[PDB]
Amino acid sequence: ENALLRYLLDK
Amino acid sequence: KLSEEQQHIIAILLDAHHKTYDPTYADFRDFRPPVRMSPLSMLPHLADLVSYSIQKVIGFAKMIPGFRDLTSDDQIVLLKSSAIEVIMLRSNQSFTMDDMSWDCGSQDYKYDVTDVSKAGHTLELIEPLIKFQVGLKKLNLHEEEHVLLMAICIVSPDRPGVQDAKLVEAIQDRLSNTLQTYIRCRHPPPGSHQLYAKMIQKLADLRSLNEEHSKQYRSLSPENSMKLTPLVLEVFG
Ligand SMILES: C=C1[C@H](O)CC(=C/C=C2\CCC[C@]3(C)[C@@H]([C@H](C)[C@@H](CCCC)CCC(=O)c4ccc(O)cc4)CC[C@@H]23)C[C@H]1O
């Protein structure tokens, strides 16, 4: 669902 | 007074803030430009400012000791719930008492009650925000206190959706004890207790402000949504 946020947190 | 671990926490948080807040505001030049005469002429510029600020808040949160150790799902809920509050807090650095505005280094990048309303926000909601900013500014906090409060704000066990509330609570308690100890090194009782009680009250105020805007928000029914950014859309739902 929260794909952009997830990416921002993993990088 | 401050143990090495408490000092280590502060050092990390100071460095996190310094990496994520640029007091020159040079990046503002890459935003959609501010427009003051529509009718929501400030919404593109202010939407970019919020989007940018959410990214900075994510940066800051990732450096909070133990935050990364939480599940991704808990990291996501904590950030979605806290982002606007941390933005309101961090924004106090630009806020100026003489004008009641957020001054970001130039007339064009100087935001007042009317500019915020041109972003589609109600005067009734904006007034408490200004009041908040004035009250915070009057506390005249050290940067150590400022970054610890931002951190404490993010890592709250009582945000909706948190699965691992004990773990989240353990982090916040370490931050809280560090904050309490910091204050006590700067002030004997009872001034220490009074200053901490004021910071606690400011966090409750932020929370009430979030809950009031999101109450409004959740109770709203494209032309403005079109002007938001993909990250703002995702975070704000
Ligand atoms: C880099 C900086 C600089 O210090 C400049 C900054 C200034 C901050 C400002 C000045 C302009 C207006 C800003 C961005 C405010 C936003 C537009 C707020 C308006 C507050 C409500 C009346 C957006 C609120 C909002 O859209 C919302 C709130 C709760 C929800 O559940 C859903 C949505 C909140 C903080 C306001 C932000 C900071 O990150």
* Calpha distance B178→B199 (Å, rounded): 14
Helix (H, G, I), strand (E, B) or coil at B220: coil
Give resolution, Å, one decimal.
2.0
- C-alpha B27 to ligand 1 mean position (Å): 17
Q: Where in chain B are the domains?
A: 1-237
* Annotated binding residue B91: no
* Annotated binding residue B53: yes
For chain B, say whether A2 makes contact (Cβ under 8 Å): yes
Q: Which residues contact B204 (CB under 8 A, 6 or more apart)?
A: none
Experimental method: X-ray
- C-alpha B206 to ligand 1 mean position (Å): 12
- C-alpha dist (Å) from residue B209 to A1, B141, B205, B226: 26, 21, 6, 25
Q: Which of residues 73-92 of B touch A (CB under 8 A)?
A: 75-76, 79-80
Give yes or no for a contact between B163 and B129, defined as CB atoms under 8 angstroms apart: no
Class of domain B1-237: mainly alpha
Helix or strand run (H / E) with residue B96: strand B95-96
If one counts every other C-beta atom within 10 angstroms of the C-beta of residue A11, the result is: 7
Q: Which pair of structure tokens corresponds to residue B48?
A: 């970019």
Is the Cβ pair B80, A5 closer than 8 Å?
A: yes
